[PDB]
Amino acid sequence: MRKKIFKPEELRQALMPTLEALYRQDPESLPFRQPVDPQLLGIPDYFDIVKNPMDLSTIKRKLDTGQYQEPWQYVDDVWLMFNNAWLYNRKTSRVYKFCSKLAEVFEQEIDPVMQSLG
Numbered sequence: 001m002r003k004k005i006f007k008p009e010e011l012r013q014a015l016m017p018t019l020e021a022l023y024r025q026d027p028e029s030l031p032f033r034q035p036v037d038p039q040l041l042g043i044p045d046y047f048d049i050v051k052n053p054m055d056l057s058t059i060k061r062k063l064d065t066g067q068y069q070e071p072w073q074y075v076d077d078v079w080l081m082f083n084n085a086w087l088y089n090r091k092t093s094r095v096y097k098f099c100s101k102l103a104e105v106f107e108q109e110i111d112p113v114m115q116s117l118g
């Protein structure tokens with residue numbers, strides 16, 4: 001099977017608008033722009049529950065520097081960010097609701113872009 005047919009710089013160009021769409025969500029992107037800081041947020045159990053943290057700044061730096069070698073690796077990091085927030089936070093919470101808003105934006109933005117890689 002063929003692997004890594006796209007250049008990382010091709011993935012950067014194709015996928016960047018889906019990431020920019022998340023950054024444009026105000027105020028829903030604000031809890032996701034920087035890594036969760038458990039000390040600042042007073043949630044000392046965060047790293048016990050969330051074993052692989054992810055946030056927009058980490059995704060952005062990986063995409064900007066061509067670290068994604070397959071399109072699904074980017075998609076998996078975005079989903080990891082969402083799934084961590086839904087896992088840790090109460091379904092009734094503001095962060096949980098804001099996560100769901102971002103995931104809805106991402107779903108609408110990502111489907112046509114993945115088709116354009118077909």
Ligand SMILES: COC(=O)c1cccc(C(=O)Nc2ncnc3nc[nH]c23)c1
Binds near residue numbers: 089
């Ligand atoms: C620059 O950072 C901020 O301004 C800000 C504002 C409000 C909330 C947060 C924040 O990270 N809250 C979170 N609490 C629990 N779990 C989470 N998962 C993602 N964010 C989570 C950040």
